[PDB]
């Protein structure tokens, strides 16, 4: 409700006047940190290659995880099948050689 030290708590953006802490809309937008912002940031939406590991809350943005057979901040890449000479694919890392 009330802006502590000019700032609103996580999951809130301060009102236009400066007196109120409006809450972020769950599913729509979020804020992660103590802030005096005019809006909450909109949730990330998942691309094709991806699934929604954690849905977007008010304190947390959405985690999209690359699907089975790929990895990642712009598009999911196909994993390197083999290693180069003289040298496991996850949803966030290539193969390590």
């Amino acid at each position, epitope marked *: 409700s009330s802006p502590s030290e000019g700032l609103c708590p996580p999951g809130h953006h301060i009102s236009e006047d400066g007196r109120d802490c409006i809450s972020c809309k769950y599913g729509q937008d979020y804020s992660t940190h103590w802030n005096d912002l005019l809006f909450c940031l909109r949730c990330t939406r*998942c691309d*094709s*290659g991806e699934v*929604e590991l954690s849905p977007c809350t008010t304190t947390r943005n959405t985690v999209c995880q690359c*699907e089975e057979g*790929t990895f990642r901040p712009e598009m*999911c890449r196909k994993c390197r099948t083999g290693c180069p000479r003289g040298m496991d694919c996850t949803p966030w890392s290539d193969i390590e050689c």
Partner: antibody
Amino acid sequence: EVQLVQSGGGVERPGGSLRLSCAASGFTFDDYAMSWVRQAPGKGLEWVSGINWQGGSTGYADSVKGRVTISRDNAKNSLYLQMNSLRAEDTAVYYCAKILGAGRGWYFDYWGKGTTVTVSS
Amino acid sequence: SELTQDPAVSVALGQTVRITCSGDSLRSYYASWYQQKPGQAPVLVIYGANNRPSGIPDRFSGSSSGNTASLTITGAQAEDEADYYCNSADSSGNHVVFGGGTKLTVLG
């Protein structure tokens, strides 16, 4: 540029079997995910099944789950959909479609000419 | 599951039209649009964010607020009287889902 040849416009009695085959040329095939997506006479598109670049991920629409099966032979740049125990509601045109990424997905950047399948009692 | 788009809309040649596609999973999965001229293979128009494959006109534009995606044609020409569908993943992430399609007529 990409090319996709479907084939085998089949007339089949209910409870019968088909094997839709799609071949693809003009792009690396094993780099990309695939999917079948259909459409009955003048009545909206409907996603059938999806496959991963490698062949691991395989997705099937409730309306077909267990009845059809999906598989690719990256050695022959081919992608199949075996059908088993057809339904009169499986009367559709079937488009094999290239999904844009390597992972199983919903952005079909290319669409074959599509094979017609008719199921009548 | 099921994202519902109006079955029929219209535009006067040279005007703008927005075809909206609505479904409680478009809150957490980017949209994607196709075009289907009577008896052609659907042709991908706008995949997610707002990026368009090489070869489709500038005129076209995808957008998203809340649980609605919206395809937008500016200055709709004669060669746009076609069916436009939308799709995302379902509520979970495993299935795909298509909009009931919109018959966009261009007013001749």
